[PDB]
Design a protein around this ligand. Sequence first.
Ligand SMILES: *SCCNC(=O)CCNC(=O)[C@H](O)C(C)(C)COP(=O)(O)OP(=O)(O)OC[C@H]1O[C@@H](n2cnc3c(N)ncnc32)[C@H](O)[C@@H]1OP(=O)(O)O
Ligand SMILES: CC(C)(COP(=O)(O)OP(=O)(O)OC[C@H]1O[C@@H](n2cnc3c(N)ncnc32)[C@H](O)[C@@H]1OP(=O)(O)O)[C@@H](O)C(=O)NCCC(=O)NCCS
Length: 293
Amino acid sequence: AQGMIICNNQIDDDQLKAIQDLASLCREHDGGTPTFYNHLLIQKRPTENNVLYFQDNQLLGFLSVYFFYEDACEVSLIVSPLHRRQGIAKQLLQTIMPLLTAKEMTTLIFSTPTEINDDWLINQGFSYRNSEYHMQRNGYDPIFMPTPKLHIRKATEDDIPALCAIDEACFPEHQENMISRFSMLLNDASYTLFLASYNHIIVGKAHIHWQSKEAIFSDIAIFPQYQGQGWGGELLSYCINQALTSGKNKLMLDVETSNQNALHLYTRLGFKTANVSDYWVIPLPQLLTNWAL
Ligand SMILES: *SCCNC(=O)CCNC(=O)[C@H](O)C(C)(C)COP(=O)(O)OP(=O)(O)OC[C@H]1O[C@@H](n2cnc3c(N)ncnc32)[C@H](O)[C@@H]1OP(=O)(O)O
Ligand SMILES: CC(C)(COP(=O)(O)OP(=O)(O)OC[C@H]1O[C@@H](n2cnc3c(N)ncnc32)[C@H](O)[C@@H]1OP(=O)(O)O)[C@@H](O)C(=O)NCCC(=O)NCCS
């Protein structure tokens, strides 16, 4: 008999592959997994945010907290489907709550696989917020496009006013960091900000972040006034074919949404939903009375 609880501030390489093996076992049974931020896990973070639960040399539970907002934190938590309703989740949370009360936390955000937990979550005071589709296009075949009607080019530092017009109309979350954020993106060769123009009028954009064997798509936008014309599909088509020409076949795209109709164009250019996570909110004091402290 042996139980062991490790609480640290950085996931080492072998711990990471134990965590990924446990997560894959949960994907086997749950149809999906919570959202993990691997770059944050393997980073030396200021506090002890990771909790690993072992039983006879076996990783059975894992929790990590991410401090994104001010009074809110995101929690990714998994327990071996073969060892559930044994209190492993309350043990992991008991471990982390001293850190949470010290940071003055008031609200917890849990990422969860869809459907399977809906009824007991809502019956315990959790509130659904949104969902996230982690998409991948893995085919080697390019997109065969009709007559191109857009001119598409890499944005230089001289397209900032157009980039800021696009952001103002589509990405209000960057309002007051926008010029300085663009100045760094445009002077980083691992980022390509594609500008789409129809008859010399700029109609939208899309970002590609190049990695050594992947390409990460983000910040796709067509102005609402221009969204009927087929330009969103042409722009994204062009970016896909650019990544394939560049020798990257793992194309990533993450979409936060509460309705699946925001997936129509992407799935139709060959992206598929590799994982879906739901995000539920609960007041911290309510969680520690429904779960014994
Ligand atoms: S201020 C602008 C804010 N930006 C966003 O919210 C970013 C995400 N969406 C977009 O930038 C545009 O909605 C995209 C997805 C690029 C579509 O632009 P377009 O409307 O120009 O693209 P097409 O005309 O080529 O495509 C029409 C086809 O696909 C589905 N569609 C509409 N809206 C979406 C969204 N939001 N997500 C996925 N698919 C979407 C449609 O089926 C639309 O086709 P129909 O002919 O309308 O059936
Ligand atoms: C829930 C999970 C995260 C931990 O489960 P666990 O170790 O089985 O949790 P516990 O045994 O600590 O039980 C704690 C509270 O679970 C709630 N809970 C867990 N599973 C539940 C279920 N299937 N139905 C109702 N409540 C459940 C209860 O309040 C349980 O309380 P009780 O048994 O004392 O009444 C596990 O089901 C899992 O890893 N699921 C997949 C990942 C996921 O959904 N993460 C999101 C968590 S919000």
